[PDB]
Amino acid sequence: SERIESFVETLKRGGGPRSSEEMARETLGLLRQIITDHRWSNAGELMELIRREGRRMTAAQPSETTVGNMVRRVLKIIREEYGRLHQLQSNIIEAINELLVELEGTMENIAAQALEHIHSNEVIMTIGFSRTVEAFLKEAARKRKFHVIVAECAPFCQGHEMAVNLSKAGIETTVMTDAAIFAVMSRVNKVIIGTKTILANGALRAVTGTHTLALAAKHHSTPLIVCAPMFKLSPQFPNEEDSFHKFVAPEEVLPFTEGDILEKVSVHCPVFDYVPPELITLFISNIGGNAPSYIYRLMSELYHPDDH
């Protein structure tokens, strides 16, 4: 039925399911359902329906790149499925089920490869809460006691919660304000950041302090990993400008109090930022450990030239 419309409203109003493959489980859900029982013609009328419902879905807040990402991957499974087909619903829904089960284990396998990086007594450093970086760092509690420096930035700040969820289970964290990321980072090694979405050229679109942070990395020459799973490799190299973000209400940065000053003064609030591929020095991923400058072909491994 048209419960997807509710879903089309659900992404419209906001209220995030915290990126935990819930957008992916949902997009797989609705694509499974529209894939299940709909109109049927042989010659990709299903694919045309995927383009229509696709572009209607992408008409949401243009930041949830996972929605269109798994949409396009469903299309590539359709194209290869027909490619071998040269009863298709059985093969398509089965392979989509296999992609679901493969998606069902990202946060474990991307966290197994952790002992091979962090060593004893090694002052790691991140910024901003992320599920994968916390799970990833929790499987390195069967090794020695390092430190963790976490930045408290990007207000409204969703960051501390992580400083709790770590320090009551693990290593000796300290929490620094965002405006002190250059007295620190003279005494550190091995920076990690989680990623909101990563671009085709090799860019990280992340939380609103990622840049200003990576610049310090390629100033003191410390390597920064951006641990990010699959299904977040977005096409469309950074052409569209200023729709790249989320501008939120300036209540979060200035209070509605202090009247009259708020007549003539301009307030800005960006949620994301731009990390170019000239500063990332490894990707830890779900299947391999690929470098920055290789990421290109990995994208060609997944998609098809209908990247629009």
Ligand X SMILES: O=C(COc1ccc(Cl)cc1)N[C@H]1CC[C@H](NC(=O)COc2ccc(Cl)cc2)CC1
Q: Which bin fits 44, alpha (ψ -120 to 50), beta or left (φ > 0)? A: left
Q: What is the nearest approach in angstroms of ligand X to the Cβ of residue 177?
A: 11
Question: Of ligand X, a copy of itself, none, which one does residue 245 interact with (CB within 5 to 8 Å by kind)?
Answer: none
Helix (H) or strand (E) holding 225: strand 224-225
Determine, following the binding rule CB under 8 A, whether residue 219 of this chain makes contact with a copy of itself.
Answer: yes
**Site stretch for a copy of itself (CB under 8 A), options 39-47, 72-80, 220-228, 267-275:** 220-228
Q: Is the peptide bond before 156 cis (omega within 30 degrees of 0)?
A: yes
186 binds, among ligand X, a copy of itself, none (CB under 5 to 8 A by kind): a copy of itself
- 219 makes contact, choosing from a copy of itself, ligand X, none, with CB < 5 to 8 Å by partner type, with a copy of itself
- Which of 66, 89, 7 is closest to 234 using CA atoms? 66
* Range 69-83 burial, b when 16+ CB lie within 10 A, else e: bbbbbbbebbeebbe
Binding site for ligand X (CB under 6 A): 121, 123, 147, 149, 174, 184, 187
Tokens 């990007």 sit on residue:
154
Which CB atom, from 90 or from 121, has the smaller least distance to ligand X?
121
Q: Does 189 bind a copy of itself (CB under 8 A)?
A: yes
Binding mask 69-108 for a copy of itself (x = CB under 8 A): ----------------------------------------
Q: Residue 149's binding partner, choosing from a copy of itself, ligand X, none, with beta-carbon cut-off 5 to 8 A by kind?
A: ligand X
> Going by C-beta distance under 8 Å and a sequence separation of 6 or more, which residues neighbour residue 238?
199, 201, 203, 244, 274
Q: Which of 87, 186, 243, 293 binds a copy of itself (CB under 8 A)?
A: 186
211 CB-contact burial (10 Å; exposed 0-12 / middle 13-18 / buried 19+) = middle
User: What b/e readout covers 98-117, taking b as 16+ CB neighbours within 10 angstroms?
Assistant: ebbeebeebbeebbebbeeb
Minimum separation from the CB atom of position 216 to a copy of itself (A): 10
Q: How near is the Cβ of 180 to a copy of itself at its closest, in Å? A: 17
Q: Which of 16, 165, 187, 278 binds a copy of itself (CB under 8 A)?
A: 187
